[PDB]
Structure formats: C-alpha cells, structure tokens
From a paper:
Coxsackievirus A6 (CV-A6) has recently overtaken enterovirus A71 and CV-A16 as the primary causative agent of hand, foot, and mouth disease worldwide. To initiate infection, enterovirus particles progress through a set of distinct functional intermediates: the infectious native virion expands into a destabilised altered or A-particle, in which the internal capsid protein VP4 has been displaced.
The structures of the altered and empty particles of CV-A6 are similar, and the capsid proteins forming their icosahedral asymmetric units can be superimposed with an r.m.s.d. of 0.31 Å for 633 of 638 Cα atoms available for the comparison. The buried surface area of 4400 Å2 per protomer within the altered capsid is less than half than that of the virion. Like the previously studied enteroviruses, the conversion of CV-A6 virions to the altered particles is connected to the loss of ordered structures of VP4 subunits and the N- and C-termini of the major capsid proteins, but also of surface loops of VP1, VP2, and VP3. The structures of the altered particle and the virion of CV-A6 can be superimposed with an r.m.s.d. of 0.82 Å for 548 Cα atoms of 659 available for the comparison. The GH loop of VP1 (residues 205–214), the EF loop of VP2 (139–143), and the GH loop of VP3 (175–186) are structured in the virion but not in the altered particle. Residues 45–47 from the N-terminal AB loop of VP2 form a short α-helix located near the twofold symmetry axis of the altered particle, whereas in the empty particle these residues are disordered. Because of its position, the α-helix may stabilise the altered particle prior to genome release.
Author numbering:
A (entry chain A), D (entry chain A): 62 to 204, 215 to 292
B (entry chain B): 30 to 138, 144 to 251
C (entry chain C), E (entry chain C): 1 to 174, 187 to 233
F (entry chain C): 1 to 49
The structure:
C-alpha cells in the first residue's frame, strides 16, 4: 500500500550506483570457416553499451579501478581443456598483428594463461589516465573535436595458444566491475538517442523528455 | 476475565519517517467509544458468525468517517461479546480473534473465490458455512492457538478480548485490508425445554483503542 | 596457509550443511523490522496450548458434533460414557489438537500431558462423572469399581464446570500410551423444564516438561 | 520401551523447524525436440510443494533470508562442461523473453556463471518484502481477494550460455534453505486438501481431522 | 589450515561478488589525485536539486514551451489552470526532473517532495492562484471551492514571485501518488500596455528524507 | 579454515603475479655475496649521467 519508513542511504551512493560486474563486450575468437584468425584484439570500452554509457555520463570526471572477468566457452556452451592467452596491452603499446606475432611474447604486456575448463579468469586494471580522472566530456581539440586520448584504458588481445587453426570459435564475455569510484561535476542524464560511439551527436527529430498527455488539466495518459 | 491478545496492550505507534513530517491524527472519546452492533439470535441450528475489523465499523459513526476519508489507519480494539440466556438455557460459544482471517470458498466435488459479502460482511457480520473448518480450511479444534474466550452458558455469559494492532506494516488501508476477524462459534449447540425463549441474544460491543489516522483526503 | 590438501567431503552438497554463501545483492538494506505482537520462537509453546480433542470421532458423526462427548440421563448405572488413549502421535482424538499435529512432525516425544473437561449442560444440571486414567501397562477398565481403584477423579457438575487431568508421562519412539475413561458415577439429575442431555468438551495440551526429537515430515498432507 | 528422560528444546525451536535445505522447484531448461527454448524463467515460490506450504502456513508473518542451491545435470545424470547462467531477477524487474534477449546482459540482475561439472552454485537472497515480514495470509484486496504482491521474492532465469540450440535438456533442482527465520502469530495447521496454489480454497467434501473409530467407548480402530 | 573442503559456490562467477583480484600491473603508481571541485558521493544530493517540471507535456507542444504553464486573463472564474501528479517514477512531467530520472534507476522510493512555482509575468501583473495538493486517496478536485477545503496555498503574484509546496509523503514499490492542481483564485489583473499572458515555471525536487531501494536499470535508454 | 570456496582467478597464470613457489633445491646455500663496487638500484641514476 504505502512504504511508511525510509529505505536508507547505502544504495544511493555513487560507489553502489556504479558497482556490480557488468557485460562490457562480447569478444569472438574466430578460428574456422572464412575467418581463421585464431585471435581477437578488443579495445577496453567502459561505454560499449548505451545503458552503461548513460550511467557513466551522469559524471564529467571519474576515477576508478576496473576488475575484468572473462567468461569463455564454445558455440554449444561446452568448455573443454583449450588453453587461452588473455594479454593486456597497456595504452601506447603495440598490438598483435596475427596469431603468432612477436607481441604475444612481450613481457611488459601482462598475460593470463587459463583453460576454458577453469573458472573464469579475473584481474584488476588500475586507474590508467595521465590526468587525475577519466574525462567523459572533453570540450576541446587534441591539437576531431571532443576526442581526448587520456581515456585509453588499453586492449585485451585474446588468442588460443595453438600452432595451426583449431576450427573452434571461442566466445569471450568480458565483465567489468568499477572499483573505488570517485565522480566529479554531476550532469543531466542523456535524453536523446545516441547516434555515434564517441560524440554527443543526436538526430534533428528531437524526442520530448516527458511522455505526452491530452491536456494540461487531465491526469489520464 | 479479560483476554489480552498476545500479552500486548494496544498503544500508539513509535516515531515513523512518514509520520514525522505530518503527525498522525489521534481521535478521542468522540471516535474511541462503544459501538453496539445489531444483536445476533443464537438458535439450535446456528453455525456461528464472524466480523471483519475494521470493516465492521467502516460505515458507522465518526470512526467510519475517519476510516473512509483517511489514507492510513492503525488501531487496537476492545471487544465485548455478551449473551442473554436464562439458567435453563445450555450451550457453549467459542469467541476467537483470528488475525488475517482469509475466508476460503468451497468448491463442489466451481466456486473457488468467495464474494465480497463473505470477505467484507460489514456491521451485520456473516454466518459460517462450515464452522468445523472455520470456512478457511483450518480445523476449529485448533482455533484455540488464536486469542479466545469460552462462553459456557452455565458459568459466564460475557467475553472480553483486547486485540492490539497486528500487521506487517505500521499503518494500512482500513477500507481494503481487514487486520483480524472475530468469530463466535457455538461448539455445544443451544438446548432448552419447551416454553423457554427459542433464541439466545448475542451482543457484540466494540471500542477502538488508540486509533490513529494519516493523510485525510 | 598456502599448502593445502582437499579432504573427502570436498564438492559435496549436504542439504543440512549450515554454511555461508555470498549475498546476491550486497549493500541491499532490507525493510527494518517493526514490533509485531505474537512472536513465537518454539513449537513447545504451541504444544502447551489447550486445543479441543475429537473424542467423538465415530463413524457417521460430522462437523462440530465430533468435538462433543454426549452426557444424558442413563437407565443403567455405573456405565462407561467415553474412552480415548492419551497418544498425541497416532490416529484418533489427538489428531485434532495442536500437540497432536506437532508430534507428527517429530519421531520421538516424551513428557506429561494435560486434559481438561468442560461440562456445557444447564446451570441447574448436577451429577458425578468418574474420570479414570489407566497407565500404559493395563487395558481399559471393565467397570466403574475397577476404575475407582486406579488413578481417578470424581467430578461433580454442580460444583465445578471444568476439571484438569494430568497424565504423568507418555513417550514414543521410532506407542506405550495410557487410557482415559469417563464413567457415570451418578445419574444425570435435572429439575423439571431442564434438558436431560448435555455435552463434555475435552481439551488436550502438553506440560512444561514435554520435548520432541528427530524432526520428521508429516504424513497428514 | 519408555523414554525416561527429556529430549531437549533445540529441535522444537522455530529456527530448527524451518531449517535444512529443501527442494522448492524442478526447473527444466529444454533445448531439443519441439521445445528449443534454451532457457527457463522460474518464479521463486517458497510454497511450491504442499509439505512446505503447510509448514510455512503455521505462521501468519515470517521474516527470513533464503539460500538457494542449484543442482543441475542432463537427462542421464551426466554433468559435462556446459556453461550455464543463473540470473536473479529482483521483484519488479523485466524478465527474459528469449535465449538472447537483452535482459540477460542487465547488470542490476545478478548472475551466476557456473559449469555443470562444477559443484552446485549457491547464493543467499535477503529479505525482499516492502513490509517488515512476508504475509502468508493477507485478508484484503490489492485495490483478487487475498493476493498480496509484497511476497514476490523474484525470479531465477536459467539459460545455457550458447549461440544456437544445444539439443540437450538441463534439469535444475532448486534447493532453498530458510535462514534467520522469525515467525509471528501461530495458526492451526491446514486440515483440508489444497485445491489451488494461492488460496485457502477447499472442496465441499470435508475430511474429518481425526480418523474414525467404531464407538466412543472402544479403543480399537 | 592444510585440511580443506570445497563447499557449494566453488568456481562460480557471481557478478555482484565484491572479491579481490591480483593487480595486472603491480608497482604501477597511478596519477596522484589533485583537488577537483564538485565531487558528489550520493545520488540523493542530485535528487534534492530543483529541476524544471515538464507540466505542459501536451500533444503538439514542442521545445522550451513544454516547461511553461500558461496563465492568462480568464473570461470565466475559479477555472483550473493546470494539474499534475506528484509521481517521480512514472511517465509525465517528473520525467524531465533529476529526481524523476534517478527514481527510474531504482524500484522503490519514499519521502517528501518539494515543488516550487515561479511566476514570470510583468512586475505590474497581479492576481491570485490557489495551489491545491490532494493526497493519494482522492481524485482531482472538481472546483476551486473543493480544492480550498484540502491542503492548499493561496499565491499572490504581486507580493511573491515564487512559492514552495511540500508534499508530505509519496512512495512506490515493485503508484500511491497525490495530485497538485492550480486554480484561478482571481482574474489576471494588469495595467494598460502590459501583457495579459504570463507563464508559471514548476520545479521539482526531493527533501532530505527521500531514499531509494533495489537498484534497477532504466527503461528510458 | 576447513570450509573454502574457490573464486574466479583460480588456476590462472598471470605473468605479473608476484607469488611464492617452492625452492627446487631446499637447503642449497648460494655463494655468499662479497662487496662489489658500482651497485645501482635505479634507472634514474643512469638517466642523470
């Protein structure tokens, strides 16, 4: 009927708001048919999905640590003993060009060796920006408009540790948990549909923030 | 003499976040008085009666006015059940207060859902269809776990039960939620000899205790 | 420490293991608990509440009539009115009591019972019943004279409307039960224009020393 | 012969009475033949079985935490390395519509990723009601009779993490352990057969609480 | 110690588990944090900021006109100017407010709201509006006379340009909302060469006692 | 204690994890360290030359 009491303040904190591990990317390691790459390079994008992009863009500046979990299996959900390498390429480091490129052996690129039959690999990436916080909104030019390169968090290059093609596609579900989040300068929530991935661009067909009703005096929609 | 339900005296609700911003209305003797319902005729073939609270007082006097025109409600009740029987009348009544008395329907071996006249009988109350299962699929023999008093015509003719406010919420809607049911069930049927009055009057007197109302419409 | 051996019982789901599991929603604050009257923390408190015995549990008796022991003016003398066993667990009159229903959720119980008799005749009706308890050793007494030699109470209607009988000890295991018999000590005596038939309501409960062992699902439902 | 001593009071507590992990649902994730759904949505029902419904309905109000264990295998009892997602849908959150619906990626729906070859997944759901306790009996109208929506505990949506149909049915046995139980206002145990899942409805053919005997004076059934 | 048993919940990835994972780059020192103005650690601080209500959310009204309640010289008397429900969660004027947007990220909320009205007519314009609040029990008042009997404010333009209305309590669960109505207490009075049409801007916010429960993804994006 | 759950990150080889591994030759005593001139513990000392 009516909640007589108060719900507490814990779940209204910024720490709780930006918490819980969430899907930030579905990486496919194709090794069969027309795509026998046997590896994939996935740029770390906290704003891959619109739901998370809208929540993060409530802030202007944000400092956090990210914990990544890789949930990997084959097409039919099976997890055999295939060995996989999860390489973290820090910002400003070369990326692998092929299945057996020399960047897979670079010691300064941290790697995780895990089997598909193992529980999901997990690792914490620290705060990586040259600035004191990540900028979701940068109003200026590097030297395109609004493209700050200080929000590069790195790359996850994933391959099967194999000699020739295995004929098996590996689906990697990347889960990211924001940790020790601090947010600066609250902003309005986005009200328009996102057009592109890195811009505030919106369509000329502007949608009204509030749903329409018949008249300013009626209370039925 | 007086049955105190669950050993809990009715009282005003402790400080609430919703009631802190707007203090709830606490009416006095004008509302908290004795309401005497219509008398029930106890006969040989009677199966018993039940009333829903505060549905029984929802259209009666100033309490009915407060109940209908307030969003939220909280109150204890002091209920008196009295009989007018001669010493030549015999019978036993069980007076039981059943919290959250959900009345079940009886499906012929299909009415699986009781109508509004059974769920909300009003001030006139409702007669039991199957007093053996209390019209709710639970045995009458075990109904003594609820607060109760016996009316044995040879020992006592009156019962008093004080029921405090019992709910999972500190307040609730009076018009669409019944906190408890009051059932009067003849266990030992009324017997008498020719020339005695063929019915024993049963009178229910109700006094709201520590009534509280919030959000006057 | 770091060195570890996994023992037998690893990776087993024991349905009675009271372990710890991670919360599904960390930092969720449940509705705070208000005071609610009538909290019960023990099934023995329910066992100690008097509930009606279905002593008249005979073939052809239906509804509320099964809770009433009929007492009437007797042509014969020293007759037996009613008998029942003091056995909360097994089928019979105790099935209708709260202690009888709780005992079916357990395998073993012991302690003292309490039986209350309520006479519901006219204020003008008088007479005597002999309420006899036979311990689990013997069979049902054949005569009122035999019942008077054992544990018994002589109950007068005109003085006391209710009497309490205490069964000193009953027990059960994976029945050893006594018997209660009600005898017509005197004829049922009434003035003119008074009903010559009345009823006794029998109530049953457990004492403060009753206990339950080895929780076991009920066969009622 | 006779239990001379007392059995103690520990097993007669409400905490012990409502304890031990018990089967509350058998969820089938069908992926083959005419049913190639590849997922199932199971509403959390503490009263799925009559045995548990009767025990819970001894109380009117009850506050507890629930711990859930998922015991999963295939038709022939095999447990290969298939990866499964166990999503908890909190009360008032959208449910998945298909095998690849977007609600599977919602971060506010907690998920468990576990393999069939892993030991059973386990997680604690807290007290979820907007009221101070769960109401097994609500005598009123929402605005059907007796249908309180405050007892919604959520939904367990289970799927295999797979792209196309696997052709394998997964049986999930859901075990629930009630924790930190507090119960209010004792009620009589149900004596009539349950007709429907959410109502106290009973058939007009009323069964007697006590088993019949030949006469009120005989002790043989 | 060395002896160990693995319990259920071993090898499970719970997306809400706040565990520890090894750092990807040990001995990496992040950019030290400088002072940045405007740190916010709570979404309730954003809920407590007044934001414009889209009260004129009618069909055919576009752009900034949707934020303005028109007030003009009325041929008739005691007319209703505008009404809206005080319901942050559901669709309507509160969709354009910050508290309305945050409430869609949660399932349950309760507390007091604050509504401010701003009159933006000429300095020379004068008149009275009756601002009435109806609690969730009742429907919209039919006349200014009925609205005067409940909670109301009589607002004079010539004295105060802005008035604050406080809604004592609203709540929502897995709407029970009041209604605010604006009535023409007097005619709109202006000297010559003064516009006879003006606007009211309505702002909405939460009080210090507003709270949020059970974080839930938004359906706006 | 004896009750235990294995978390994500079990059985993973992270090349930057500074864990402990058992010695291949326990009770082997390496050659004791003599003083050698020109020890450097920082690349910034080389940057400053």
């Amino acid at each position: 009927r009516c909640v007589m009491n108060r719900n507490g303040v814990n779940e209204a904190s910024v720490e709780h708001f930006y918490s819980r591990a969430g899907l930030v990317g579905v990486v496919e390691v194709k090794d069969s048919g027309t795509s026998q790459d046997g590896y994939t390079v996935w740029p770390i994008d906290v704003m891959g999905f619109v739901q998370q992009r809208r929540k993060l863009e409530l802030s202007t500046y944000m400092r956090f640590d990210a914990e990544f979990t890789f949930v990997s299996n084959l097409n039919d959900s099976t997890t055999p003993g295939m060995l996989l390498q999860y390489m973290y390429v820090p910002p400003g480091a070369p990326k692998p060009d092929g299945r057996k490129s020399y960047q897979w052996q670079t010691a300064t690129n941290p790697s995780i060796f895990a089997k598909l039959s193992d529980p999901p690999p997990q690792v914490s990436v620290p705060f990586m920006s040259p600035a004191s916080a990540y900028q979701w909104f940068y109003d200026g030019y590097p030297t395109q408009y609004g493209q700050c390169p200080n929000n590069m968090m790195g790359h996850f290059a994933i391959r099967t540790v194999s000699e020739s093609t295995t004929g098996k596609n590996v689906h990697v579900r990347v889960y990211m948990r924001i940790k020790h989040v601090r947010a600066w300068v609250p902003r309005p929530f986005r009200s328009q549909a996102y057009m592109v991935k890195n811009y505030p661009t919106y369509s000329q067909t502007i949608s009204n923030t509030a749903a329409d009703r018949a008249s300013i005096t009626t209370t039925d929609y | 003499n007086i049955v105190l339900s669950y050993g809990e005296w009715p009282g005003y609700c402790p400080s609430t976040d919703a009631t802190a911003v707007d203090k709830p209305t606490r009416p006095d003797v004008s509302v908290n008085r004795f309401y005497t319902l219509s008398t029930k005729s106890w006969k040989t073939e009677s199966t018993g009666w039940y009333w829903k609270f505060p549905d029984v007082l929802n259209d009666t006097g100033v309490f009915g006015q407060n109940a209908q025109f307030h969003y939220l409600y909280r109150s204890g009740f002091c209920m008196h059940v009295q009989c007018n029987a001669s010493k030549f009348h015999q019978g036993a009544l069980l007076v039981v207060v059943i919290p959250e008395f959900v009345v079940a329907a009886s499906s012929p071996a299909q009415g699986l859902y009781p109508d509004f006249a059974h769920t909300n009988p009003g001030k006139e109350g409702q007669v039991f269809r199957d007093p053996y299962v209390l019209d709710a699929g639970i045995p009458l023999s075990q109904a003594l776990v609820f607060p109760h008093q016996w009316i044995n015509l040879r020992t006592n003719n009156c019962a008093t039960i004080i029921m405090p406010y019992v709910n999972a919420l500190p307040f609730d809607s009076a018009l669409n939620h019944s906190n408890f049911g009051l059932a009067v069930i003849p266990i030992s049927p009324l017997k008498y000899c020719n020339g005695a009055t063929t019915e024993v009057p049963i009178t229910l007197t109700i006094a709201p205790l520590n009534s509280e109302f919030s959000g006057l419409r | 420490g770091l060195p570890t051996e996994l023992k037998p019982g690893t990776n087993q789901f024991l349905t009675t293991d009271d372990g710890t599991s991670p919360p599904i929603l960390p930092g969720f604050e449940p509705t705070p608990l208000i005071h609610i009257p009538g909290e019960f923390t023990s099934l023995l408190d329910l066992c100690r509440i008097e509930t009606i015995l279905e002593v008249n549990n005979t073939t052809g008796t239906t509804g509320v009539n099964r809770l009433l022991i009929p007492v009437r003016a007797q042509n014969n003398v020293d007759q037996l009115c009613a008998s029942f066993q003091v056995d909360p667990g097994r089928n019979g009159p105790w099935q209708s009591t709260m202690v009888g229903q709780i005992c079916r959720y357990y395998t073993q119980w012991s302690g003292s019972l309490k039986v209350t008799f309520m006479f519901t005749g006219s204020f003008m009706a008088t007479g005597k019943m002999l309420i006899a308890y036979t311990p689990p050793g013997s069979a049902q007494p054949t005569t009122r004279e035999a019942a008077m030699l054992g544990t018994h109470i002589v109950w007068d209607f005109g003085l006391q409307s209710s009497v309490t009988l205490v069964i000193p000890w009953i027990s059960n295991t994976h029945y050893a039960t006594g018997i209660v018999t009600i005898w017509y000590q005197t004829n049922f005596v009434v003035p003119p224009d008074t009903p010559s038939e009345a009823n006794i309501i029998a109530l049953g409960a457990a004492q403060e020393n009753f206990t339950l062992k080895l929780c076991k699902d009920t066969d009622e439902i």
